Design a protein around this ligand. Structure first.
Ligand SMILES: *[C@@H]1O[C@H](CO)[C@@H](O[C@@H]2O[C@H](CO)[C@@H](O[C@@H]3O[C@H](CO[C@H]4O[C@H](CO)[C@@H](O)[C@H](O)[C@@H]4O)[C@@H](O)[C@H](O[C@H]4O[C@H](CO)[C@@H](O)[C@H](O)[C@@H]4O[C@@H]4O[C@H](CO)[C@@H](O)[C@H](O)[C@H]4NC(C)=O)[C@@H]3O)[C@H](O)[C@H]2NC(C)=O)[C@H](O)[C@H]1NC(C)=O
Ligand SMILES: *[C@@H]1O[C@H](CO)[C@@H](O[C@@H]2O[C@H](CO)[C@@H](O[C@@H]3O[C@H](CO[C@H]4O[C@H](CO)[C@@H](O)[C@H](O)[C@@H]4O)[C@@H](O)[C@H](O[C@H]4O[C@H](CO)[C@@H](O)[C@H](O)[C@@H]4O)[C@@H]3O)[C@H](O)[C@H]2NC(C)=O)[C@H](O)[C@H]1NC(C)=O
Ligand SMILES: *[C@@H]1O[C@H](CO)[C@@H](O[C@@H]2O[C@H](CO)[C@@H](O[C@@H]3O[C@H](CO)[C@@H](O)[C@H](O)[C@@H]3O)[C@H](O)[C@H]2NC(C)=O)[C@H](O)[C@H]1NC(C)=O
Ligand SMILES: *[C@@H]1O[C@H](CO)[C@@H](O[C@@H]2O[C@H](CO)[C@@H](O)[C@H](O)[C@H]2NC(C)=O)[C@H](O)[C@H]1NC(C)=O
Lengths: 114, 305, 307, 114
């Protein structure tokens, strides 16, 4: 029975920083992949970042290309998103999805208001 | 990402562009050229076009030997393919997506699965049957046939049903026109990882064992009784030759994706051998006319009344 | 308010109820039971199913043999051609439209169905005008082969297109008939803009009456060994070919006139659609005769089949 | 070239009366049927009334059943709608269509405000 925690995030300074978390529960974690996806206040979900099951190859959108950075802990069942040099449009509710999809399991996410 | 995974589906194409949409919602013309979807419907039409007549004549003429029971059993399942599966995929080729819906996909994949498995397990029966006549291990031993043709449906449904149970699932493949077992996503919720093993084990390896187990008995082996034997035991060979030609490519790519899950492969990679393996409906009876002379005579009897 | 007339269409059903919608927009399940639309697709499938194989073998076998160059074979290949134009041009559209329950393809989607339904009947008709003329010239022997036949089979297409093209010109038009699955000439609305009143005359005159004249004109000439066995069976087949054509086309032709006479009257959707779909057997029955009756063909067909 | 005039109509008594007209031009009039159709200010067109080409059988909606009454002049190429004992919901723009359709061919209409 699947359960993704959505820890890390809050109100942050324009041009600040913040580290996100995502504790996975109830599945073979290392056996598949995990993504980060955010909900901008107004427009549809943006696929932020993603990473392979082994964790070898991360991928980012142009929007947060190199500012954000993604990495996962297979042992602990966790996914992180170190967001740096933030902006006002990075203000959104961040969800961590499984597989390769923008389809969000869990929810509430993390309201990272910049 | 390389491919785009969704609840129902997996599109072998990066949504980096933003273009990717569900094949249970919108047409998938970003995957391939829109005329290639028309080419599928063109190809897929002709499978249904020469599917029904060749199988229906072969079904009719037979009812109007163990071999004939099986090659009627195939004419049955080939018509289940044509009307059950091919119809859906010919219509889906038009729209460019499973417009019928998730259950619309299950149809396509189910009778594609029956067709291959009932074709496979029938060649397991044809393998067993000549070994018992040619090598002559049990003396005077050929209603036997009707029991062993019921076997093919028993085992094919062991393969085709469980996706519909919810162990594994049927999922749009390649151009999102055919459907088949989930080789792509681990989908541990569905546990489809384990099924792919079960299928390549119980519904591929075990059959091909018993086939070449019986075929290997006639390595030391290979008047008119044996002419009838020869041409019909030769047809058993040509029937498998065709089955290997047909199903190998798709089976190979299916495993290749299962091995390299999440890797970079295009939509056409899988769809080509998948649609190629849908000739299983038509080629089987064409052999049964072409090679089996006893049938050919009596087919023309029914035709030319 | 018996029927409901629109820009493109005419629905044989009162829009007193408010239910009536265009058959170029929504399915017409208020007209008949939804399973009857499925029954149409079922029927219409089997026309395409036994349409292609019977016609394609008959097309292939005739051309493959360098023999089989008798006027009869030219016509019955010409039909195998037009019957395949029917199957792929017309029947496909109506089999698909039967599914959805309306001309989903659009106004031009209707034109397809009606056009090759019109060619099929006219090329079948004008071919029986040729078969009528040809068996009079040999049997009664008034004027004492290959070139003759090809000229007179080109005639059938010339005249069929005189009939089928003008709807697409904009004189008359193709319009959904009965259950709104088949299409045909506008017998329903006056549509004087289209002038389709005048066309129906032209068609029943030039493309029905004139043919049936020349048919029975030649048939009336023949009121008063083995060459004549070949003659007999093939001149008998000319008869059976017309017998079938009258069986086929009369019902629809009758209802088509009945509506033309009683425009605006009270008639159901099934009234017209039944004889219309019945007359779409023209694609399949023609070659079935050519195999059944013509023995010389049947031999050579099995040659091609059984290599 | 078709031309339908839409004469008769205006502001009228609650429970009043009014006779409408429809001069047809540019077609064989008696070969055609003719209808009346109104546009309520708010909701979709109502098929008011209709009559056969010969003029034999007039047909009305239950909305205006017996209150309204339709008749046509083949000689003069005209269609009339004698509206009697009117109501506030009879307030609409009336069009005269050809054939049997609520498909409205071009006319002024007539804003009969009750
Ligand atoms: C491939 O990549 C594409 C990239 O776009 C991706 O498309 C996006 O898919 C997601 C779904 O996974 C879509 O998200 C939804 O968008 C809804 C609105 O979308 C329309 O409207 C916006 C503008 O508002 C347009 O930009 C857009 O073009 C659409 O026309 C949005 O309403 C959804 O979010 C609401 O619903 C979720 C789910 O229930 C909820 O959790 C959210 O909170 C949200 O509700 C909000 O509530 C507030 C407060 O009450 C309310 O005021 C507000 O209206 C709601 N929020 C919004 C934004 O309206 C959801 O985010 C996304 O739009 C798609 N983008 C586009 C451009 O299409 C594909 O999915 C990918 N394909 C595959 C197969 O992977
Ligand atoms: C059989 O009879 C039915 C009876 O309903 C006909 O259905 C109606 O057809 C008319 C055709 O014009 C439609 O009229 C149009 O309605 C628009 C609004 O309708 C929608 O929105 C309202 C709410 O605002 C709802 O009440 C309604 O249900 C609809 O969802 C109007 O805005 C249109 O006005 C515009 O065009 C007209 C052109 O005549 C102009 O005069 C206007 O100024 C304006 O620009 C228009 O009046 C009507 O809505 C239909 N009703 C239904 C079912 O919704 C069928 O058409 C008829 N079938 C056939 C085949 O003839
Ligand atoms: C999309 O699929 C491609 C394959 O088609 C994936 O590329 C693979 O990426 C991994 C990790 O970066 C590569 O592993 C490394 O490759 C080097 C060089 O070949 C090897 O020496 C190292 O030991 C290491 O294993 C892998 O080889 C590579 N495959 C190829 C052949 O390209 C990629 O992960 C997918 N893209 C994403 C991010 O989804
Ligand atoms: C619908 O068609 C019917 C005929 O099917 C029409 O019925 C005629 O009605 C007129 C009176 O308006 C009579 O004079 C005729 O004798 C009727 N014919 C018969 C014998 O049924 C009817 O007019 C049409 N409906 C409308 C209102 O157009």
């Amino acid at each position: 029975q699947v359960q993704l925690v959505e820890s890390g995030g809050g109100l942050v300074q324009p041009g600040g920083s913040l580290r996100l978390s995502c504790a996975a529960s109830g599945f073979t974690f290392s056996k598949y992949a995990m993504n980060w996806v955010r909900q901008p206040p107004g427009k549809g979900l943006e696929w932020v970042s993603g990473i392979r099951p082994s964790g070898d190859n991360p991928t980012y959108a142009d929007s947060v290309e190199g500012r954000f950075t993604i990495i996962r802990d297979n042992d602990k069942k966790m996914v992180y998103l170190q967001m740096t040099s933030l902006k006002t449009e990075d203000t959104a509710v961040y969800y961590c999805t499984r597989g390769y999809g923008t389809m969000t399991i869990e929810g509430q996410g993390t309201q990272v208001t910049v | 990402m390389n491919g785009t995974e969704g609840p129902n589906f997996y599109v072998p194409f990066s949504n980096k562009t933003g273009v990717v949409r569900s094949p249970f919602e919108a047409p998938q013309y970003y995957l391939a050229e829109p005329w290639q979807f028309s080419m599928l419907a063109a190809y897929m039409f002709l499978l249904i076009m020469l599917g029904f007549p060749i199988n229906f004549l072969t079904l009719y003429v037979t009812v109007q030997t163990p071999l004939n029971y099986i090659l009627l059993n195939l004419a049955v399942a080939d018509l289940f393919m044509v009307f059950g599966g091919f119809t859906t995929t010919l219509y889906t080729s038009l729209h460019g997506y499973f417009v019928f819906g998730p259950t619309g996909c299950n149809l396509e994949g189910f009778f594609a699965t029956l067709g291959g498995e009932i074709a496979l397990w029938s060649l397991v029966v044809l393998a067993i049957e000549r070994y018992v006549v040619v090598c002559k291990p049990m003396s005077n031993f050929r209603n036997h046939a009707i029991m062993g043709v019921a076997f093919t449906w028993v085992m094919a449904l062991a393969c085709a049903a469980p996706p519909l149970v919810g162990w594994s699932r049927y999922i749009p493949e390649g151009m999102q026109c055919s459907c088949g077992i989930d080789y792509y996503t681990p989908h541990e919720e569905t546990n489809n990882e384990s099924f792919v093993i079960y299928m390549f084990v119980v519904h591929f390896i075990i059959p091909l064992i018993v086939i070449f187990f019986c075929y290997g008995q006639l390595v030391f082996t290979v008047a008119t009784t044996q002419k009838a034997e020869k041409e019909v035991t030769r047809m058993v060979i040509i029937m498998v030759i065709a089955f290997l030609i047909c199903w190998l490519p798709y089976a190979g790519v299916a495993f290749y994706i299962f091995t390299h899950q999440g890797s970079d492969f295009g939509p056409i990679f899988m769809t080509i051998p998948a649609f190629f393996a849908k000739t299983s409906a038509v080629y089987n009876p064409v052999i049964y006319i072409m090679m089996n002379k006893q049938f050919r005579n009596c087919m023309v009897t029914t035709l030319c009344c």
